[PDB]
Amino acid sequence: WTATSGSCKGRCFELQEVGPPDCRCDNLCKSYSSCCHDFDELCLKTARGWECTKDRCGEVRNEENACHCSEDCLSRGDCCTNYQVVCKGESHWVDDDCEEIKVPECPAGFVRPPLIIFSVDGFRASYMKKGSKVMPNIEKLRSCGTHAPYMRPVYPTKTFPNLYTLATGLYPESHGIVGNSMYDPVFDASFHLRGREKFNHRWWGGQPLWITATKQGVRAGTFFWSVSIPHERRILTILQWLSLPDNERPSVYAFYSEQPDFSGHKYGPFGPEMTNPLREIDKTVGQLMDGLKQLRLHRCVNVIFVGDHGMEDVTCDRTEFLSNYLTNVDDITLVPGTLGRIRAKSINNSKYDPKTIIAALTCKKPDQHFKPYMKQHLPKRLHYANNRRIEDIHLLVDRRWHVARKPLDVYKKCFFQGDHGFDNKVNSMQTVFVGYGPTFKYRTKVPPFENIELYNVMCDLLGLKPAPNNGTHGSLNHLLRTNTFRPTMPDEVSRPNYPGIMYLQSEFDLGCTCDDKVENKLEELNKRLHTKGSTKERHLLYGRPAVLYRTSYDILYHTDFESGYSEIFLMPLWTSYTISKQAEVSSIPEHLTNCVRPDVRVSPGFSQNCLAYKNDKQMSYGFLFPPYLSSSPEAKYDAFLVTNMVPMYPAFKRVWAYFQRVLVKKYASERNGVNVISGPIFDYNYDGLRDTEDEIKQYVEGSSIPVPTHYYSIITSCLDFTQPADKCDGPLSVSSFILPHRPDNDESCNSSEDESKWVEELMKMHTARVRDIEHLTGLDFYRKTSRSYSEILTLKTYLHTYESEI
Numbered sequence: 042w043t044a045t046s047g048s049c050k051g052r053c054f055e056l057q058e059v060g061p062p063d064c065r066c067d068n069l070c071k072s073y074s075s076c077c078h079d080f081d082e083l084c085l086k087t088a089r090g091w092e093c094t095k096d097r098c099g100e101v102r103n104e105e106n107a108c109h110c111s112e113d114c115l116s117r118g119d120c121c122t123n124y125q126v127v128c129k130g131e132s133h134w135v136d137d138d139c140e141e142i143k144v145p146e147c148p149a150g151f152v153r154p155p156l157i158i159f160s161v162d163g164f165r166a167s168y169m170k171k172g173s174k175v176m177p178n179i180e181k182l183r184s185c186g187t188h189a190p191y192m193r194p195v196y197p198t199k200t201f202p203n204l205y206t207l208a209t210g211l212y213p214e215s216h217g218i219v220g221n222s223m224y225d226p227v228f229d230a231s232f233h234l235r236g237r238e239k240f241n242h243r244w245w246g247g248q249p250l251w252i253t254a255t256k257q258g259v260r261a262g263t264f265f266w267s268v269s270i271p272h273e274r275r276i277l278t279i280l281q282w283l284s285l286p287d288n289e290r291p292s293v294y295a296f297y298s299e300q301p302d303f304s305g306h307k308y309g310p311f312g313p314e315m316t317n318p319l320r321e322i323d324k325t326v327g328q329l330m331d332g333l334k335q336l337r338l339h340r341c342v343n344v345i346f347v348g349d350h351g352m353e354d355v356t357c358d359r360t361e362f363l364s365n366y367l368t369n370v371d372d373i374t375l376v377p378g379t380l381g382r383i384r385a386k387s388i389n390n391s392k393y394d395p396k397t398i399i400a401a402l403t404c405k406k407p408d409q410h411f412k413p414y415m416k417q418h419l420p421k422r423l424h425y426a427n428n429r430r431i432e433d434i435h436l437l438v439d440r441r442w443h444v445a446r447k448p449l450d451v452y453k454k455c456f457f458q459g460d461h462g463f464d465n466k467v468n469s470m471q472t473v474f475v476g477y478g479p480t481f482k483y484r485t486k487v488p489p490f491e492n493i494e495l496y497n498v499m500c501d502l503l504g505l506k507p508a509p510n511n512g513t514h515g516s517l518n519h520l521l522r523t524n525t526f527r528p529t530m531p532d533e534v535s536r537p538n539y540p541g542i543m544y545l546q547s548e549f550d551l552g553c554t555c556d557d558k559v560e561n562k563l564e565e566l567n568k569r570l571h572t573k574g575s576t577k578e579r580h581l582l583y584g585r586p587a588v589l590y591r592t593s594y595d596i597l598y599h600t601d602f603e604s605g606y607s608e609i610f611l612m613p614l615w616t617s618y619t620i621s622k623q624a625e626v627s628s629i630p631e632h633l634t635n636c637v638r639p640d641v642r643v644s645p646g647f648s649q650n651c652l653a654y655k656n657d658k659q660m661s662y663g664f665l666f667p668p669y670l671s672s673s674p675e676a677k678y679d680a681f682l683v684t685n686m687v688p689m690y691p692a693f694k695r696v697w698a699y700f701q702r703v704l705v706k707k708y709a710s711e712r713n714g715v716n717v718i719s720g721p722i723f724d725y726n727y728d729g730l731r732d733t734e735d736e737i738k739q740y741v742e743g744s745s746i747p748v749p750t751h752y753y754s755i756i757t758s759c760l761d762f763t764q765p766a767d768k769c770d771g772p773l774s775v776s777s778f779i780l781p782h783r784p785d786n787d788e789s790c791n792s793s794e795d796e797s798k799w800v801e802e803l804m805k806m807h808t809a810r811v812r813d814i815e816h817l818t819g820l821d822f823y824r825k826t827s828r829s830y831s832e833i834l835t836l837k838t839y840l841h842t843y844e845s846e847i
């Protein structure tokens with residue numbers, strides 16, 4: 042109920058919202074049909090259009106005008122944006138040479154450079170190059186300012202999850218907006234794109250930038266605009282806000298454009314119809330910059346031009362229907378489209394069973410265009426599991442495709458030619474970033490980065506302390522001229538023990554055997570030094586990882602690898618080794634086929650035992666440092682130590698063995714040596730964070746050996762690959778993975794073929810940032826390099842995507 046009896050006179054686009062039933066004049070009132078009767082007449086004036094003309098110059102002010110060309114307009118801050126160009130012979134901002142902005146050039150009374158966020162919905166990264174001819178203002182922003190070739194959105198690459206990530210620096214699973222559409226089983230309520238419940242408040246977690254600004258005494262324009270407010274009026278309103286007195290004037294502003302997403306849905310990302318929407322966005326940017334230039338603010342304000350997601354080609358004819366797979370299709374609810382989420386239509390259905398559903402959806406058609414997942418088995422890089430609103434069963438849909446429940450849903454509910462929502466590493470989903478202003482760098486290109494990082498930077502640009510978030514604060518320091526954030530390394534919480542030889546062989550009753558008992562001061566002194574850490578500088582290139590939680594662990598040195606061995610989990614937290622370009626792959630000798638050796642430095646009570654594996658019919662074991670890469674036959678005995686052993690399902694051993702025997706040597710020759718750190722991950726509650734010991738849901742049968750949910754590796758080399766990994770003078774280069782530790786290979790449809798046809802593809806799917814592995818392990822890597830810490834934070838957020846060029 043809005044008794045829209047009040048008025049909007051003197052209240053047009055009021056920053057503070059009003060409480061029902063007093064009628065609203067804020068820029069969202071249209072959306073809720075709750076404006077004052079006079080809102081259109083007073084706030085959405087249009088008369089005479091949007092531009093000054095020669096004959097309007099120095100006119101007498103007429104309040105019916107959309108914008109003014111009179112003499113006082115600059116004082117009032119309500120000139121048309123082209124006023125000084127037409128009436129004072131100035132030039133359009135786009136026609137000025139650019140000039141480095143070394144310091145803010147702001148009017149008296151400005152306490153900090155304002156930030157204007159200019160967000161565009163559906164603006165695909167490749168539009169920057171492909172549309173460059175029809176977007177001269179944006180092209181000037183891009184070339185004169187700081188820009189990335191593209192920005193990675195979060196998954197799902199939908200509008201609401203991404204806009205709210207941009208505002209909070211949080212993954213959807215944490216801020217709670219996990220979809221454009223959602224169901225919350227605890228509230229028993231749905232969140233809908235269109236209408237009410239959207240706006241209830243309880244849906245939104247974290248702390249968006251506008252609330253962060255307010256709480257710290259920085260005033261915010263609104264970040265929301267009704268669709269019927271013309272773009273030109275949006276710009277004019279921001280320009281007017283910028284003319285307010287110092288005590289009232291906001292410091293952060295957002296403009297939102299429904300385009301080019303709106304047209305891209307209809308015509309596809311590159312439909313011929315796409316050119317005009319691109320020209321119109323550019324024209325709007327032109328208006329903003331001319332407007333700012335007029336107010337003398339065009340060298341004072343920081344401007345971010347940013348997209349939520351890209352846009353892919355998708356049509357009705359590329360739809361997979363679950364009714365082709367499931368006989369029980371009426372017992373399920375599907376959230377459909379460029380992703381799938383399935384739950385039971387009825388919770389009183391006790392015959393509903395996710396395993397049989399998953400099985401009926403698994404590799405059923407030769408070119409099947411989606412893949413089913415329990416959400417905890419989704420690639421960890423997607424961070425899309427830890428929310429009650431994300432259904433247990435997820436479908437990852439191929440780019441260009443849709444999944445639907447039944448044919449009736451498509452033709453009885455072809456319109457569209459574009460859609461988005463797909464995996465966030467898909468090229469067509471990538472979006473844009475350009476920063477322009479005194480606080481950003483001049484003519485600088487920066488590497489691609491993830492949109493979760495931006496909140497921190499927008500906080501830096503405003504002098505704010507960001508709320509706790511998923512960005513890595515400092516990893517975007519190289520975008521900024523000043524206002525950088527200089528974090529310190531976290532402090533090591535646990536210090537390692539360095540055990541020496543303290544146990545006799547016969548103290549071990551582990552059920553293990555090894556044909557090794559066949560043994561000299563040349564090489565007896567030598568081997569002792571290897572156990573003391575004499576080759577450690579070769580295998581621990583960047584320092585040892587710091588353990589960031591309370592635990593008890595040992596450092597174990599060997600000729601070919603160094604390890605940090607947990608006495609709590611009975612296996613290494615990490616194992617580090619270097620493989621040079623020249624390194625040779627050997628095989629496991631026959632006599633050592635099932636060799637496991639007791640480690641005389643670690644008590645039987647802190648060791649694994651072979652009998653548990655023998656008894657455990659589903660579980661086998663593998664090694665973190667691969668016997669295949671031993672430097673000598675003598676060094677190869679170290680690789681069979683019980684303290685290098687980890688629990689592995691036979692199905693996973695196929696993956697791990699191919700990685701260790703084939704891929705590490707391959708990377709070593711392609712990269713000129715690599716350093717590898719591998720280990721286990723335990724994330725049974727799928728929250729993306731290291732489990733404590735009481736969170737482990739599975740052990741090797743009859744023992745206290747915990748079973749990892751994942752195995753990671755971090756592969757580091759010199760960015761300049763003419764230098765060997767162990768002799769690198771400058772910037773590093775990394776790729777990493779977090780492989781699910783699974784009892785079958787159902788994820789890989791081709792897995793009954795040779796590992797050379799399927800393993801590398803599975804690994805690419807499960808690519809990770811080192812930062813992902815840090816959260817999952819409580820470890821902190823690259824402690825001792827000669828690089829700046831900010832540069833190392835950038836390296837740690839890098840994701841190797843294996844997509845071809847943008």
Ligand SMILES: *[C@@H]1O[C@H](CO)[C@@H](O[C@@H]2O[C@H](CO)[C@@H](O[C@@H]3O[C@H](CO[C@H]4O[C@H](CO)[C@@H](O)[C@H](O[C@H]5O[C@H](CO)[C@@H](O)[C@H](O)[C@@H]5O[C@H]5O[C@H](CO)[C@@H](O)[C@H](O)[C@@H]5O)[C@@H]4O)[C@@H](O)[C@H](O[C@H]4O[C@H](CO)[C@@H](O)[C@H](O)[C@@H]4O[C@H]4O[C@H](CO)[C@@H](O)[C@H](O)[C@@H]4O)[C@@H]3O)[C@H](O)[C@H]2NC(C)=O)[C@H](O)[C@H]1NC(C)=O
Binds near residue numbers: 429511729816
């Ligand atoms: C990405 O960044 C984000 C932000 O940094 C990281 O998320 C944080 O993770 C923290 C550690 O897991 C978590 O800390 C917990 O806080 C609990 C109190 O939570 C409330 O207060 C915070 C602060 O204001 C608030 O943000 C929370 O909001 C959540 O909840 C509502 C919906 O439920 C949403 O509006 C909102 O979106 C957000 O949801 C998300 O977080 C929760 C977890 O908090 C998830 O479950 C949701 O699915 C969703 O993802 C809350 O309003 C506090 O209870 C916790 O403390 C327990 O555990 C500690 C261990 O330290 C123990 O000492 C305590 O005793 C306590 O245990 C007791 O309670 C248990 C639970 O009831 C019970 O089982 C036990 O038996 C004990 O009795 C804990 O400290 C923090 O809330 C979030 N913050 C956010 C914004 O998500 C995120 O991890 C990063 N991701 C990665 C991959 O790095």
Ligand SMILES: N#Cc1ccc(Cn2c3c(c4cc(Cl)ccc42)CCN(C(=O)CCc2cnc[nH]2)C3)cc1
Binds near residue numbers: 158202208267268297
């Ligand atoms: N960088 C950046 C940036 C810019 C703006 C915002 C703010 N914002 C906006 C939307 C939104 C959804 C969520 Cl879950 C959270 C925040 C969100 C929807 C579209 N938006 C509209 O203004 C149309 C409104 C409308 C559409 N139909 C009726 N009204 C903007 C957040 C980040």
Ligand SMILES: [Ca+2]
Binds near residue numbers: 654655656657660
């Ligand atoms: Ca076994």
Ligand SMILES: [Ca+2]
Binds near residue numbers: 727728729730
């Ligand atoms: Ca966990």
Ligand SMILES: [Cl-]
Binds near residue numbers: 197
């Ligand atoms: Cl969705």
Ligand code: NA
Binds near residue numbers: 554555556557558
């Ligand atoms: Na023996």
Ligand code: NA
Binds near residue numbers: 788791
């Ligand atoms: Na398979």
Ligand SMILES: [Zn+2]
Binds near residue numbers: 163200302303306461
């Ligand atoms: Zn869209």
